[model samples]
Target: GSTTKRVLYVGGLAEEVDDKVLHAAFIPFGDITDIQIPLDYETEKHRGFAFVEFELAEDAAAAIDNMNESELFGRTIRVNLAK
Candidate 1:
């Protein structure tokens, strides 16, 4: 499953948040290499979502179970595999 590790897209986040928060939220389950939160060029702000690439598929699934609908920063977040 190492080669099948999932790329997860997390949405419905506050624009003020950053990758560090995501890394901290997931590192306990497995190794994470990158967290990309894109910004809308026209708005010049975060798109309120991000992608997290996990090294193991199991870990990625664990992240989804542990994070989805979980409250952080006064809002509920959503996590799922990137399509």
Candidate 2:
């Protein structure tokens, strides 16, 4: 099992999701440090995934179980520890 990492990977995100929306979704899980939603190379639209960092590794892991497959905005999101 991975015992390292405070960053979480979120996928299957809706097109409307942004750093603000992502913050609202994962705040209760722990103290968030950063929320990154990358965008397309040409279009300015965000990709279908994001990277979120928590203050505690435990919080990150906990989020995986609590948030995985949960619906957000309009899609079922997949949460996992960042590689």
Candidate 3:
């Protein structure tokens, strides 16, 4: 399906991290439509990452460049355009 939202795949997240903290880290770049950290169905814990949807593709690209090696919650994160 077609969608206007540009999503970013955020990896290397700390297992204990939450949505608020994750959003705060990316809020500086632009407005975010959503942040979803998928959880393990069996464990009920996050899978150590998230998908952040941005309002603009430019912001997504910028995030990819700016946040790829940035530290978040005491660990380095990897951000990329979601395929």
User: Model 3 over residues 12-70: C-alpha lDDT tens digits?
Assistant: 88766766776777777756778887767788877688888788777877778888988
State each model's C-alpha RMSD to the native: 3.0, 1.7, 2.9
Query: How do the residues 17-83 of candidate 2 rate in per-residue lDDT, one tens digit apiece?
Result: 8768777778788777898876677898765888989988898877788789988877889998887
Model 3 has an lDDT value of 0.77
Write down the TM-score for model 2. Answer: 0.85
Error of 3 at 80 (Å): 0.6
How accurate locally is residue 34 in candidate 2, as Cα lDDT from 0 to 100? 96
What is the per-residue lDDT of model 1 for residues 12-71, given as tens digits with 9 covering 90 to 100?
788556789888877775567789877677887765788987888788888888777777
TM-scores for every predicted model = 0.81, 0.85, 0.82
Q: How far is candidate 2 from the true structure (C-alpha RMSD, Å)?
A: 1.7
Question: Highest TM-score, which number?
Answer: 2
- What range of 10 consecutive residues in model 1 has the weakest lDDT sum? 1-10
The TM-score, computed over Cα atoms with residue i paired to residue i, of candidate 3 is: 0.82
Query: Any idea how many clashes model 1 has?
Result: 0
The per-residue C-alpha lDDT of model 2 at residue 33 equals 83
- Point to the candidate with the largest lDDT: 2
Better structure of 2 and 3 per TM-score: 2
